[PDB]
C-alpha cells in the first residue's frame, strides 16, 4: 500500500502461551509507547510524547476482546497452532567504535514468531545484566515480529560480546559475536 | 517438540499520503500469521481475507453500530492522531554524525539521524564516484534514529582528497567530510 | 491531547 507515512493505532497481541499480550502504537515503524498491562500504565518511548495521555484500560479492554477472539479461532480452526519461525540475528554498534568511548551494542532479532523469545548478552563469555534494555515486539507486515536489545559499553581491546537468543525455532541457543576490532 | 502456542493479532493501520489529503484505514484481524478479515475504509465494509474470517465479516457487517464506528475511524483515529504527529514525531530532527575511516576501502559512517530521508555520495577530487560503491540498507536502530554505512573501493594517489557528502532534511546544507592518504 | 485507538469487536460464536 502506497503511503508517505504508516501508523499502527495500535498493535494488539494475545497468545495462549502464558497466556500473554501486548499493546503498542507505532509510527513509521518505531514504537511510540506500550501499555504495561499488569501495572495499567502507558510507557512512552520518545520524550516529546510524554505530554500525551493514553488510557491504559483501552489496551486491557482490547486484549479482553482478543482473548475471546483467540478462543473462537482456536475452536474454528480445529486447534491449528502457530508455526515456529527461525529468527535472524544481527549485532552492530550504534556509533563507530573508538576504544574508551561510550558506545551501545545493538542486537536485532528479526522474523520472530510466535512472539516468545529470550535475548541476553555475554561479555568474554559471562552474562551481562547491567546496561541492557529492549524494545517491545515490533510488528511486520507478514505478521511476524522483530525485537531489538541494547547493551551500553566502553569498547575495549580485550573484551568481546555475544548476543544470545533462545527461541522455539532454534534447536540450540543462537550466539552472534561482536568484536571491538 | 516445543510448546504449543496460538496467536491472535489486531492491527489498526493508518496510511497517510501527502499530509492528510489522502488517508486510509485498514484494520486487520490475524490468526497466527494469516490475516482472516479486514475493514478497509476504501471499501466501506468488512471483507473476509480467508475462509476463517467469513463468519466474522458476515456478523460484523450486520451490526450497524460497529459499521458506523469503523467508517468514522479514518477521522476519529487516523486524522485525529496525525494532528498530534504533526506537532511531535513529524517535527523530530536529529542531525547525522559523519565520520570516515579506512578498512582498500573507505567507509563513510553516517550515524544517528532522523527522519529516514538521506542522500550520501562519495567524491574523489570533487568528481562523483559511482563505481565500486557499496551501501548498507537503511539501518533502523530502534530508538528513533537510523544509521547507514557507504563503502568506497579506492586506490589513492598522492594529493587525492576523498569527500563523503551527506544531505538530510535536518541540515541547512550538506555535510562534507574529507579524507586524505 | 490523547491519541485515539482503533477497537476490535467480538468474533461470532
Amino acid at each position: 500500500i502506497v503511503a508517505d507515512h504508516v501508523a499502527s493505532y495500535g498493535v494488539n497481541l494475545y497468545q495462549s502461551y502464558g497466556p500473554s499480550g501486548q499493546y503498542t502504537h507505532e509510527f513509521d515503524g518505531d514504537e511510540q509507547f506500550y501499555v504495561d498491562l499488569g501495572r495499567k500504565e502507558t510507557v512512552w518511548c520518545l520524550p516529546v510524547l510524554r505530554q500525551f495521555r493514553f488510557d491504559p484500560q483501552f489496551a486491557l479492554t482490547n486484549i479482553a476482546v482478543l482473548k475471546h477472539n483467540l478462543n473462537s479461532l482456536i475452536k474454528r480452526s480445529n486447534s491449528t497452532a502457530a508455526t515456529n519461525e527461525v529468527p535472524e540475528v544481527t549485532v552492530f554498534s550504534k556509533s563507530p567504535v573508538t576504544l574508551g568511548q561510550p558506545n551501545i551494542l545493538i542486537c536485532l532479532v528479526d522474523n520472530i514468531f510466535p512472539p516468545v523469545v529470550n535475548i541476553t548478552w555475554l561479555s568474554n563469555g559471562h552474562s551481562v545484566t547491567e546496561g541492557v534494555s529492549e524494545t517491545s515486539f515490533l510488528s511486520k507486515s507478514d505478521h511476524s515480529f522483530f525485537k531489538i536489545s541494547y547493551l551500553t559499553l566502553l569498547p575495549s581491546a580485550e573484551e568481546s560480546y555475544d548476543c544470545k537468543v533462545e527461541h522455539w525455532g532454534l534447536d540450540k541457543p543462537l550466539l552472534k559475536h561482536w568484536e571491538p576490532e | 517438540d516445543s510448546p504449543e502456542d496460538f496467536v491472535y493479532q489486531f492491527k489498526g493501520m493508518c496510511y497517510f499520503t501527502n499530509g492528510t489529503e489522502r488517508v486510509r484505514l485498514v484494520s486487520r484481524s490475524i490468526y497466527n500469521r494469516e490475516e482472516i478479515v479486514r475493514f478497509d475504509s476504501d471499501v466501506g465494509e468488512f471483507r473476509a481475507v480467508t475462509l476463517l474470517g467469513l463468519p466474522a465479516a458476515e456478523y460484523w457487517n450486520s451490526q450497524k453500530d460497529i459499521l458506523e464506528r469503523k467508517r468514522a475511524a479514518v477521522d476519529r483515529v487516523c486524522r485525529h492522531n496525525y494532528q498530534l504527529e504533526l506537532r511531535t514525531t513529524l517535527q523530530r530532527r536529529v542531525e547525522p554524525t559523519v565520520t570516515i575511516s579506512p578498512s582498500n576501502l573507505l567507509v563513510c559512517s553516517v550515524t544517528d539521524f532522523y527522519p529516514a530521508q538521506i542522500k550520501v555520495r562519495w567524491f574523489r577530487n570533487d568528481q562523483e564516484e559511482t563505481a565500486g560503491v557499496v551501501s548498507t540498507p537503511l539501518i533502523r536502530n530502534g530508538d528513533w534514529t537510523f544509521q547507514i554505512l557507504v563503502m568506497l573501493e579506492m586506490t589513492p594517489q598522492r594529493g587525492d582528497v576523498y569527500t563523503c557528502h551527506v544531505e538530510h532534511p535536518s541540515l541547512q546544507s550538506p555535510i562534507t567530510v574529507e579524507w586524505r592518504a | 491531547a490523547a491519541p485515539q485507538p482503533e477497537l476490535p469487536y467480538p468474533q461470532p460464536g
Partner: antibody
C-alpha cells in the same frame, strides 16, 4: 440482547457488609466481552460510578471515593458479577445498579437496581 | 479525575418545545460522551453514545452534539413522556464520571 437481574433488597446493620450480585442471561457474543459497572444512587441524588470489571479478563477498576471499601468480582462460569461493600454506614443507604458497556458504546443494559438500607 | 458539569440543574418546559441540555468536561474528552434518561424509581436508559450516535430504538427527536469539552443534548419536540432527569457521562478515561443531572419538569 442480554438481561441483567440483580439480587433482592437488603437491610444491613451499621458496620456490617453486603454483597450484591448481578447475573447475565440471554446475550449474544457481546455479553462475553462486555464490561460490568456498578453505579450507586443515594436517595434524591445523581448517578455515581463506583467501579467495574471485565469478567472474561483482568482486574477490577475503582473510583477514588469507593477505593478500599468496595470489592468488585466476577465469575464467568456462573455469568454473575458481584459488588461487596464493607463497614456499612448510614450514608451507604442507596440503590445499587449493575450495568454493562461494549467497547464504551454507552452503558446500554442495566439491572433493575438493588436497594441497600443501613439501619440498626 | 474528569469533572462533568451539567446545566441547568432543572428546567421547566412545555409539551412540544425544543429543549437543550448542556454538559461540560473539566478537560478534553474528544467524543466519548453518553447521555441517559431516568424516571423516578427506574433504571437509567441510554439515549446517545459517542456524543452523537443514537442508541437503537431511541426516538429520533433526541440528538446530541459537541466535541472536546462542551456537549449538548437536544430534545426537539418534547413529549409528555420526556419529563425526567437526564445524565451525561464521560467515557474518555477511567474512573468514569457522571454529570449531576438535569431535571426537566412541566411549566405552568
Amino acid at each position: 440482547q442480554v438481561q441483567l437481574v440483580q439480587s433482592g433488597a437488603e437491610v444491613k446493620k451499621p458496620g456490617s457488609s453486603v454483597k450484591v450480585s448481578c447475573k447475565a442471561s440471554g446475550g449474544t457474543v457481546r455479553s462475553r466481552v462486555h464490561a460490568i459497572s456498578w453505579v450507586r444512587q443515594a436517595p434524591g441524588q445523581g448517578l455515581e460510578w463506583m467501579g467495574g470489571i471485565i469478567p472474561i479478563f483482568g482486574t477490577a477498576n475503582y473510583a477514588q471515593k469507593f477505593q478500599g471499601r468496595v470489592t468488585i468480582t466476577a465469575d464467568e462460569s456462573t455469568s454473575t458479577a458481584y459488588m461487596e461493600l464493607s463497614s456499612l454506614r448510614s450514608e451507604d443507604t442507596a440503590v445499587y445498579y449493575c450495568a454493562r458497556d461494549v467497547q464504551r458504546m454507552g452503558m446500554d443494559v442495566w439491572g433493575q437496581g438493588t436497594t441497600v438500607t443501613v439501619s440498626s | 479525575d474528569i469533572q462533568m458539569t451539567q446545566s441547568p440543574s432543572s428546567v421547566s418546559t412545555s409539551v412540544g418545545d425544543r429543549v437543550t441540555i448542556t454538559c461540560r468536561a473539566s478537560q478534553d474528552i474528544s467524543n466519548w460522551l453518553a447521555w441517559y434518561q431516568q424516571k423516578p424509581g427506574k433504571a437509567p436508559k441510554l439515549l446517545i453514545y459517542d456524543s452523537s450516535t443514537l442508541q437503537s430504538g431511541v426516538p429520533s427527536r433526541f440528538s446530541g452534539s459537541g466535541s472536546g469539552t462542551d456537549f449538548t443534548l437536544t430534545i426537539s419536540t418534547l413529549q409528555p413522556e420526556d419529563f425526567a432527569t437526564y445524565y451525561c457521562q464521560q467515557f474518555n478515561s477511567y474512573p468514569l464520571t457522571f454529570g449531576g443531572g438535569t431535571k426537566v419538569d412541566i411549566k405552568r
